[PDB]
Amino acid sequence: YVSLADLERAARDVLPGEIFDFLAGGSGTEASLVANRTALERVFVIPRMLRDLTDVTTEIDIFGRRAALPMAVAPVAYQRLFHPEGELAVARAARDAGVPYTICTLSSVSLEEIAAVGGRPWFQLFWLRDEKRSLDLVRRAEDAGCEAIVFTVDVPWMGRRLRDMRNGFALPEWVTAANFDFAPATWESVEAVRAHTDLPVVLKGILAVEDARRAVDAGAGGIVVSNHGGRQLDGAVPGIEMLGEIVAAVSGGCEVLVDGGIRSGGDVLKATALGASAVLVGRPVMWALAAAGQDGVRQLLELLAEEVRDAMGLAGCESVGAARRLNTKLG
Amino acid sequence: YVSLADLERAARDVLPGEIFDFLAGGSGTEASLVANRTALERVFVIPRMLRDLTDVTTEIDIFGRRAALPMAVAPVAYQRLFHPEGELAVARAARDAGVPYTICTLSSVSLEEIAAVGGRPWFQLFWLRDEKRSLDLVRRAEDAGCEAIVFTVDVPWMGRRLRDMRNGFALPEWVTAANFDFAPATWESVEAVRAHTDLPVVLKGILAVEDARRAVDAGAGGIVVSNHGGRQLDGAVPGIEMLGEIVAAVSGGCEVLVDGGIRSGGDVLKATALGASAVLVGRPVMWALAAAGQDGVRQLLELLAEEVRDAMGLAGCESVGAARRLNTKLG
Amino acid sequence: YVSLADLERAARDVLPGEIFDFLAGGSGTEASLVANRTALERVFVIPRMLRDLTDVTTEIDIFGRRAALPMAVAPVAYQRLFHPEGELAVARAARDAGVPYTICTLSSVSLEEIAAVGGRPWFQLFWLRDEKRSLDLVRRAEDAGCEAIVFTVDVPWMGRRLRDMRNGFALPEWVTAANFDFAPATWESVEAVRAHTDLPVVLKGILAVEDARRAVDAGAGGIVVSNHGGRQLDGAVPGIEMLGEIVAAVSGGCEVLVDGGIRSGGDVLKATALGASAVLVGRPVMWALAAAGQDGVRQLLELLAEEVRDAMGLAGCESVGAARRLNTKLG
Amino acid sequence: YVSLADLERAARDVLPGEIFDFLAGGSGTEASLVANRTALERVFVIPRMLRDLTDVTTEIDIFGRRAALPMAVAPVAYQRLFHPEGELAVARAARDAGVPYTICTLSSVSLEEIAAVGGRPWFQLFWLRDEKRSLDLVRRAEDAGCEAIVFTVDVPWMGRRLRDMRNGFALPEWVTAANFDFAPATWESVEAVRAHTDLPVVLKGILAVEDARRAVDAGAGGIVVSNHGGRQLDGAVPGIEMLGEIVAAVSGGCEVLVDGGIRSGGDVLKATALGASAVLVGRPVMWALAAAGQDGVRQLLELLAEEVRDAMGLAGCESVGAARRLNTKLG
Ligand SMILES: Cc1cc2nc3c(=O)[nH]c(=O)nc-3n(C[C@H](O)[C@H](O)[C@H](O)COP(=O)(O)O)c2cc1C
Ligand SMILES: Cc1cc2nc3c(=O)[nH]c(=O)nc-3n(C[C@H](O)[C@H](O)[C@H](O)COP(=O)(O)O)c2cc1C
Ligand SMILES: Cc1cc2nc3c(=O)[nH]c(=O)nc-3n(C[C@H](O)[C@H](O)[C@H](O)COP(=O)(O)O)c2cc1C
Ligand SMILES: Cc1cc2nc3c(=O)[nH]c(=O)nc-3n(C[C@H](O)[C@H](O)[C@H](O)COP(=O)(O)O)c2cc1C
Ligand SMILES: O=C(O)[C@@H](O)Cc1ccccc1
Ligand SMILES: O=C(O)[C@@H](O)Cc1ccccc1
Ligand SMILES: O=C(O)[C@@H](O)Cc1ccccc1
Ligand SMILES: O=C(O)[C@@H](O)Cc1ccccc1
Ligand SMILES: O=C(O)[C@@H](O)Cc1ccccc1
Ligand SMILES: O=C(O)[C@@H](O)Cc1ccccc1
Ligand SMILES: O=C(O)[C@@H](O)Cc1ccccc1
Ligand SMILES: O=C(O)[C@@H](O)Cc1ccccc1
């Protein structure tokens, strides 16, 4: 595998069609899904030359911990859909690569088992039905050693995924929500979470500038600027198109991550140059999982690591901070 | 049917080619027809998160009455072309959905029969040959219980529809202008109508900002920002491209509606976010009529209702007014 | 024929390939040729409604004479290439339509014969080898009753037409330059012409704003904002893209015409709305000539006349002057 | 051959696939490779008319010497890959055309043999492993009569060329680095070179404005605004998109060249109009070499010479300086 696109074809071959579609699809006409890629493709970097590259490092510090790359594995529900080892395969590869892994509320292996793998697990929260259970999930995650709560804020309910509707797709009987035996979140829900954990709370799915500033005011330790991979509002702006304005508005008040369509180290560089602290990567991690299990994800993460270092140095950046100071031009 | 596009294919199968073309076509090279869709596709919404969605409502008040959605059925002449029950099937489904139905001057069932169906009928006016007959049609409509006069102002004569010319298309002998046994409108014609009814007069086919302001000055209760579905001037700007500027110029002085290419609840949301009070929908209603009669239109209107509610809540809007305060970004 | 595009197909059928290519082609990679159409397609008109259309007229006064449309037939060399009656067929149809016809320096029928047809002939000048012969051609034209000298200023030499090179195209022995038994023009050449005729001198092939202003200063009675149909500099900006800026810069000091890709009455309207006094039309006139001789050109000119009137009234313009006051929007 | 594109097809026929790919390819997804052409295609020139063209000259003075065209042959490593005579064939044709030829550090014929051909050789430098050897290469070049040192500054290491990886491409045993029996460059390396030669030092691969100004401050005699033909950072902005801003920032302090996708005399004109002193041309020279050896390159250079003169005069420019004062418009 010499690009992330080799892995997509290999995943399409092995997965059942309806599962491939569950993974690949977006909501509505898939406008936002396609726009995530379009938007990245319009961005060109203006590289710097003749800088010292004797110690190029891709490491960052985030939410109290060193990460090997400015990247984390995005939350993706039900990973046993893609491979029998599911979340454990992905979490092991992430641990070994030094990349944070986001454990899902709807994980197909329990959060405690996943966290036992080690590494830098984060925990993604879907707000439940009741405040007390939501907060129980948060406490479980914190007790298990998760280092951040990734509160998903863009899913008051799920988007209408027409591929799944047409396929009549439903979870196989062999995949379950292993954390169990839901409701719209509000700012009051954010406060309830913030009051009940000492972990950084990261709001995932912020697109409006006013919401980014309120997230800081609310005591968030980060946000993820995201349209949920084009799976929520069809017609929502891509995160990458809001990122620059949002980074300027928070003015260092929280970490600002982005996701949506990141498919190479050059894409990571683009996101960094627009001001992102780090990115999330979703679908490609699942392609590598589907294609080759743990070793598949490990290979993906090594290819991304090499592509990020490559891109940084070709752009004259010895550190991620320097990459953030690069300028861009739209094509 | 899980999108409006399923219905188009079903209509293409059942209708005779030349009738499908009458419906689908525009004037000239169809530039304005295509641009209506292009323009909507360029618009992205910036959704808001974490707002109270406990009582999301799609209702609006317009021209004195509650409507269930910010939408009305556009005037489309000769609906017996598409189904034997014609306008009565459409008007019944609209009534049952709580959406206003626009009765045409060139309806293939008489305006009085259509209005007898009940619901919230509006009446569209083509200016006749003489002031007295025009005003008779208006009086008939008002006497029959129509709640607004939709004066079409963009048809001093008809556009050159090359599909129809090539097809040598002509009304079958079995469809007639059931309101009977025409001339360019002017501002003087608007005043004659305004002076002779107590109903709100809505000017349909306004694109210039100066014309929107004059419509307010003239005592219009609304306008429809529209290029007549690309069927009049070929090269006329899409309404959606003028809407924001026109909403700012009238500064609350009349309702501002838009039409042209609205094909989903996400499109409704876009129009709302650009400042529209409500939209009209034309061709898709006729596709549903052609495909499945009354029940077909009912299904379409239920799908739109669900898509509008979906979109609103995913964008953090509990009401249409809140949707109007959303910001947009062009792609 | 219900569009100008029907005529192109009919011309492609009858003409020998290499002659069709001579007609259709441009210089280089044909970038400027294609851009003429692209540019027109980006322009949308903002129509006005509810104006008096009781006496819509397409007439204009130009260079001392009434014309039936804001349009003239562009100079196109060697029209016997396309039909045996060549320039006489075209000039007769133009006369009968009330449109000025531009007689070429390289006409395949003598300028005196063409002018004998009557109508409103103009004469296009290519600068010769010597000042005295150039001026003889001008005197011949004036003596024959031509009403304007269209001095071509964008051909210091001919563009590299790769279709013709590949075809090894050469004038058949049966077509000759009937005005005979060339050199780069300069501003000094313009003055020599201006000093030797009382006719309005029109500089054809102006694209820079500074050249438009100098043309006024030089005593030109008009200019044609033009990239020579994409046949001269490959990469020259389309005239339509310079027109607005040039109209503002001359501020009524001379007539400002445009050409390049005008293929409908809607295109005429666009050019007018951008500020053109009139347009030239080239290739479509030759398609109609090739397809059906005199009667073919007559049909084209009647179709354009109807399309121009149609477009004007749909846009609320009772006169060409009103069309010039329309606003536009780029798509 | 009547365009540069005829030569590409002829090269594709004769070269082995993997060598054609080595030549044609870029890094990553080839975004920057494609963008070099896109960017040129967006540029339109605004030509001037009616200027004196009695003595049109394409000559320029650069780095102390007259060149016949505002163009040089770009450095391209290992030219014996494309033809058995390699660099000598290219250098002979360049000499005979009066165009500077850039001898590569990785030339497949020794720099001394190439320079013995005569003409205006320049020498391109890749920074070595040690300062003393780098400087030896520079001294060799100067001793051999090279007239400028083209220091490549955009290759701290090589880009990831996926075509070559997929092809498993490797230098045949019959091609060697004939100058021998590498390390990231820095500004300190530039100074070491500048201190050790009296030749103008030209930094090739500058894209940021701040780097252009520092190059002047560093005592460079020129720069080449370049993304290395899309072979280094995938996502690097095209040089042509930075050129105008960089020319304004150096304000005459050094020569500013550009490369990337120059494929015609019209493209040369575009680069000149954006402010370039001269261009480099890479891939097309290798196509002509592959197709027809020395005589192939000679034919290419004659075709470019004629296309540059053609374009200049059609645009009203009697000299390259006048071409630099042309304005442009983006399409
Ligand atoms: C199959 C699938 C399941 C997902 N499940 C979740 C989830 O449970 N929670 C969440 O916050 N995001 C979820 N996401 C969204 C991802 O976290 C991420 O925002 C999106 O996939 C990012 O884009 P990418 O896949 O283009 O890299 C899911 C995405 C996919 C494709
Ligand atoms: C077949 C057909 C007939 C129409 N008849 C009328 C009419 O009688 N009066 C009118 O004002 N608009 C008429 N319209 C225009 C519609 O009211 C509406 O402006 C246009 O169709 C809106 O766009 P949409 O079809 O893209 O939703 C007609 C449209 C179509 C397609
Ligand atoms: C076959 C052909 C021959 C032409 N000959 C001349 C000429 O002799 N003089 C001139 O000024 N323009 C000449 N032109 C350019 C036209 O006058 C006009 O600028 C160009 O064709 C306008 O565009 P259109 O063909 O797109 O309508 C010629 C154009 C064509 C296609
Ligand atoms: C096969 C190949 C080899 C190259 N080798 C070198 C090199 O040794 N040094 C260098 O500075 N640039 C090198 N370049 C880049 C060229 O100098 C030039 O920047 C690029 O090819 C310019 O674009 P063009 O090929 O689009 O005209 C090479 C380019 C190609 C295609
Ligand atoms: O995009 C998302 O967040 C959802 O698709 C995750 C999910 C999948 C399946 C069932 C429930 C939830
Ligand atoms: O308005 C801005 O500043 C960004 O939306 C521009 C942008 C477009 C596409 C991708 C990234 C950024
Ligand atoms: O777009 C419109 O408004 C017309 O097509 C309506 C109409 C149809 C048929 C006959 C007359 C009128
Ligand atoms: O000028 C403006 O402000 C709008 O025309 C922009 C727009 C384009 C496309 C769609 C909607 C809006
Ligand atoms: O575009 C033009 O103006 C030329 O093609 C006219 C011409 C044709 C043939 C020979 C000479 C001149
Ligand atoms: O800069 C301007 O104002 C015109 O070039 C814009 C334009 C583009 C395309 C067509 C016409 C006009
Ligand atoms: O683009 C470049 O500069 C390299 O491809 C040149 C090179 C080719 C082969 C081996 C080493 C270096
Ligand atoms: O910003 C500018 O001024 C140039 O990037 C514009 C440009 C685009 C494409 C080609 C050349 C120039």
Chosen for mutation from C233, C243, C246, C330 (greatest number of chain D CBs closer than 10 Å) is: C233
Assess contact for A320 and A71: CB atoms under 8 A.
Answer: no
Amino acid code (one letter) for A15: L
- In whole angstroms, give the CA distance from residue C78 to residue C290: 12
B141 CA to centre of own chain:
18
- Residue B73: both structure tokens together: 């059925």
- In whole angstroms, give the CA distance from residue C62 to residue A85: 82
Cβ separation D45–C236 shorter than 8 A: yes
Q: Tokens 């005579």 — which residue?
A: D85
Beta pairing partners, A329: A44
C134-138's contacts with Cβ under 8 Å and 24+ in sequence apart are C134/C189, C134/C192, C134/C193, C135/C192, C135/C193, C135/C196, C137/C105, C137/C111, C137/C179, C138/C193, C138/C196, C138/C197
- In whole angstroms, give the CA distance from residue C244 to residue C235: 19
Quick one: which H or E segment has residue C106? none
If we measure between CA atoms, which residue out of A150, A152, A149 comes closest to residue A198? A149
Residue-wise over C174-207: b if at least 16 C-beta within 10 A, else e? ebbebbeeebbbbbebbebbbebbebbbbbbbbb
Q: Tokens 């360019």 — which residue?
A: B184
- Residue C263: both structure tokens together: 């293929």
SS3 C183: coil
Assess contact for B154 and B226: CB atoms under 8 A.
Answer: yes
Alpha-helix runs per DSSP H in A109-226: 111-116, 131-143, 162-167, 187-195, 209-217
Assess contact for B109 and B101: CB atoms under 8 A.
Answer: no
Residue D129 has a CB neighbour count (10 Å cut-off) of 9
State the Cα torsion B185-B191-B192-B193 to the nearest 10°: 80
Region class of B66: left (phi > 0), else alpha (psi between -120 and 50), else beta: beta
Atom number of ligand 11 nearest to Cα D161: 5
Q: Are β-strands A278-281 and A71-73 bridged in parallel, bridged antiparallel, or unpaired?
A: parallel
Residue B180: exposure state from Cβ atoms within 10 A (0-12, 13-18, ≥19): exposed
If we measure between CA atoms, which residue out of B167, B165, B159 comes closest to residue B235? B159
Q: How far is C219 from chain B (nearest CA, A)?
A: 36
- In whole angstroms, give the CA distance from residue A14 to residue A291: 7
Our answer on whether D and B touch (3+ beta-carbon pairs < 8 Å) is: no
Q: What are the DSSP E strand ranges found in chain C? A: 43-46, 60-62, 65-67, 71-73, 101-103, 121-125, 149-152, 201-206, 222-225, 255-258, 278-281, 327-330
If we measure between CA atoms, which residue out of D276, D294, D248 comes closest to residue D88? D294
Assess contact for A257 and A271: CB atoms under 8 A.
Answer: no
Assess contact for A205 and A226: CB atoms under 8 A.
Answer: yes
Cβ separation D28–A266 shorter than 8 A: yes
C87 CA to centre of own chain:
15
Distance D115 CA to ligand 5 centre (A): 66
- In whole angstroms, give the CA distance from residue B22 to residue B166: 11
SS3 A121: strand
- In whole angstroms, give the CA distance from residue D200 to residue D100: 14
Assess contact for D113 and D141: CB atoms under 8 A.
Answer: no
Cβ separation C314–B31 shorter than 8 A: no
Cβ separation A235–B43 shorter than 8 A: yes
Quick one: which H or E segment has residue C277? none
Please tell me if the CB atom of residue A25 comes closer than 6 angstroms to any atom of ligand 1. Answer: no
Beta pairing partners, D149: D123, D201
- Chain D CB contacts of C165 under 8 Å are 2
- Residue B49: both structure tokens together: 């998160």
Q: Which residues sit with their C-beta closer than 6 Å to ligand 9?
A: C 77-78, 106, 228, 231
- In whole angstroms, give the CA distance from residue A191 to residue A188: 5
- In whole angstroms, give the CA distance from residue C201 to residue C189: 12
Q: Are β-strands A201-206 and C201-206 bridged in parallel, bridged antiparallel, or unpaired?
A: unpaired
- In whole angstroms, give the CA distance from residue C318 to residue C314: 10
Residues in chain D: 331
- In whole angstroms, give the CA distance from residue B127 to residue B150: 11
The residue in chain B having the minimum alpha-carbon distance to the alpha carbon of residue C5 is B29
Of D231, D240, D287, D289, the residue with max ligand 4 atoms within 8 A of its CB, to mutate for a pocket test, comes to: D231
Assess contact for C46 and B237: CB atoms under 8 A.
Answer: yes
State the Cα torsion B140-B142-B147-B152 to the nearest 10°: 50
User: Catalytic: which of C228, C270, C283, C298?
Assistant: C228
End-to-end CA distance of chain B: 29
Known catalytic residues of A?
Answer: 228
Residue D131: exposure state from Cβ atoms within 10 A (0-12, 13-18, ≥19): middle
For every residue of B228-262, which 3-state class applies, written as one string? HHHCCCCCECCHHHHHHHHHHHHCCCCEEEECCCC
Cα–Cα distances (Å) from B176 to B81, B105, D17, in that order, read 10, 12, 69
How many domains would you assign to chain D?
1
Q: In sequence order, what are the residues at sequence separation of 6 or more whose Cβ sits closer than 8 angstroms to the Cβ of residue B291? A: B7, B10, B11, B14
Assess contact for D149 and D202: CB atoms under 8 A.
Answer: yes
- In whole angstroms, give the CA distance from residue B30 to residue B11: 20
If we measure between CA atoms, which residue out of B139, B264, D23 comes closest to residue A30? B264
Quick one: which H or E segment has residue C179? none
B184, B203, B234 member nearest C266 (Cβ): B234
Nearest protein Cα to ligand 11, atom 6:
D77
Assess contact for D227 and D239: CB atoms under 8 A.
Answer: yes
Cα–Cα distances (Å) from D199 to A266, D142, D143, D146, D247, in that order, read 37, 7, 11, 8, 22
- Residue A72: both structure tokens together: 């984390």
C160, C210, C241 member nearest D310 (Cβ): C160
Amino acid code (one letter) for C124: Q
Please tell me if the CB atom of residue C265 comes closer than 6 angstroms to any atom of ligand 3. Answer: no
- In whole angstroms, give the CA distance from residue A324 to residue A60: 12
Q: In sequence order, what are the residues at sequence separation of 6 or more whose Cβ sits closer than 8 angstroms to the Cβ of residue C251? A: none
Residue D1 has a CB neighbour count (10 Å cut-off) of 16
The angle formed by the CA atoms of residues C201, D326 and C244, to the nearest 5 degrees, is 55
The angle formed by the CA atoms of residues D4, D10 and D16, to the nearest 5 degrees, is 125
The residue in chain A having the minimum alpha-carbon distance to the alpha carbon of residue D187 is A50
For every residue of chain B, which 3-state class applies, written as one string? CCCHHHHHHHHHHHCCHHHHHHHHCCCCCCHHHHHHHHHHHHEEEECCCCCCCCCCCCCEEECCEEECCCEEECCCCCHHHCCCCHHHHHHHHHHHHCCCEEECCCCCCCHHHHHHCCCCEEEEECCCCCHHHHHHHHHHHHHCCCCCEEEECCCCCCCCCHHHHHHCCCCCCCCCCCCCCCCCCCHHHHHHHHHCCCCCEEEEEECCHHHHHHHHHCCCCEEEECCHHHCCCCCECCHHHHHHHHHHHHCCCCEEEECCCCCCHHHHHHHHHCCCCEEEECHHHHHHHHHHHHHHHHHHHHHHHHHHHHHHHHCCCCCHHHHHCCEEEEC
Alpha-helix runs per DSSP H in C223-277: 239-250, 265-273
Q: What are phi and psi of A44, to 5 degrees?
A: -120, 145
Assess contact for D62 and D255: CB atoms under 8 A.
Answer: yes
If we measure between CA atoms, which residue out of D157, D160, D180, D181 comes closest to residue D169? D160
Ligand index nearest the alpha carbon of residue C182: 9
Alpha-helix runs per DSSP H in D144-282: 162-167, 187-195, 209-217, 239-250, 265-273
- In whole angstroms, give the CA distance from residue C146 to residue C102: 9
DSSP state of A78: -
Assess contact for B212 and B118: CB atoms under 8 A.
Answer: no
Nearest protein Cα to ligand 8, atom 12:
B241
To one decimal place, what's the resolution in Å?
1.8
- In whole angstroms, give the CA distance from residue A247 to residue A94: 27
Amino acid code (one letter) for B283: R
User: Catalytic: which of D194, D228, D231, D283?
Assistant: D228
- In whole angstroms, give the CA distance from residue D120 to residue D226: 22
Assess contact for B270 and B243: CB atoms under 8 A.
Answer: no
- In whole angstroms, give the CA distance from residue B122 to residue B133: 19
Distance C181 CA to ligand 9 centre (A): 18
- In whole angstroms, give the CA distance from residue A204 to residue A259: 9
- In whole angstroms, give the CA distance from residue A209 to residue A189: 20
D3, D50, D314 member nearest C233 (Cβ): D314
DSSP state of A215: H
The residue in chain D having the minimum alpha-carbon distance to the alpha carbon of residue C157 is D314
Query: Chains that contact D by 3+ CB pairs under 8 Å?
Result: A, C
Q: What are phi and psi of D25, to 5 degrees?
A: -70, 165
Q: Tell me, what CATH number does A22's domain have?
A: 3.20.20.70
- In whole angstroms, give the CA distance from residue B293 to residue D39: 52
- Residue A77: both structure tokens together: 């529900």
Chosen for mutation from D43, D126, D151, D160 (greatest number of chain A CBs closer than 10 Å) is: D160
B310-313's contacts with Cβ under 8 Å and 24+ in sequence apart are B310/A157, B310/A159, B310/A160, B310/B265, B311/A233, B311/A234, B311/A235, B311/B265, B311/B266, B311/B268, B311/B269, B312/B56, B312/B58, B312/B269, B313/A156, B313/A157, B313/A184, B313/B53, B313/B56
> What is the dihedral sign for C-alpha C312, C317, C320, C326?
negative
Beta pairing partners, A328: A45
Q: In sequence order, what are the residues at sequence separation of 6 or more whose Cβ sits closer than 8 angstroms to the Cβ of residue A205? A: A152, A153, A154, A155, A224, A226, A227, A228, A232, B49
SS3 A61: strand
Could you write out the DSSP letters of every residue in A250-261?
HTTSSEEEE-SS
Assess contact for B252 and B233: CB atoms under 8 A.
Answer: no
Residue C55: exposure state from Cβ atoms within 10 A (0-12, 13-18, ≥19): exposed
For every residue of A269-314, which 3-state class applies, written as one string? HHHHHCCCCEEEECHHHHHHHHHHHHHHHHHHHHHHHHHHHHHHHH
Residue-wise over D256-277: b if at least 16 C-beta within 10 A, else e? bbbbbbbbbbbbbbbbbbbbbb
Query: Chains that contact B by 3+ CB pairs under 8 Å?
Result: A, C
A307 CA to centre of own chain:
18
DSSP state of D83: -
Q: Which residues sit with their C-beta closer than 6 Å to ligand 12?
A: D 39, 42-43, 240-241, 244, 330
- In whole angstroms, give the CA distance from residue B47 to residue C227: 46
Quick one: which H or E segment has residue A247? helix A239-250
Assess contact for C198 and C141: CB atoms under 8 A.
Answer: no
Residue C306 has a CB neighbour count (10 Å cut-off) of 13
Q: State yes or no: is D228 an active-site residue.
A: yes
Beta pairing partners, A204: A152, A224
- Chain A CB contacts of D232 under 8 Å are 314
Assess contact for B62 and B266: CB atoms under 8 A.
Answer: no
Atom number of ligand 3 nearest to Cα C228: 19
If we measure between CA atoms, which residue out of C238, C331, C246, C287 comes closest to residue C33? C238
Q: In sequence order, what are the residues at sequence separation of 6 or more whose Cβ sits closer than 8 angstroms to the Cβ of residue C189? A: C127, C131, C134, C151, D50
Residue D207 has a CB neighbour count (10 Å cut-off) of 32
Q: Tokens 């953090």 — which residue?
A: B316
Cα–Cα distances (Å) from C272 to B160, C70, C303, C317, in that order, read 20, 8, 18, 11
Amino acid code (one letter) for D204: K
Q: Which domain holds residue A21?
A: 4-330
- In whole angstroms, give the CA distance from residue C176 to residue C104: 12
- Residue B179: both structure tokens together: 């309101």
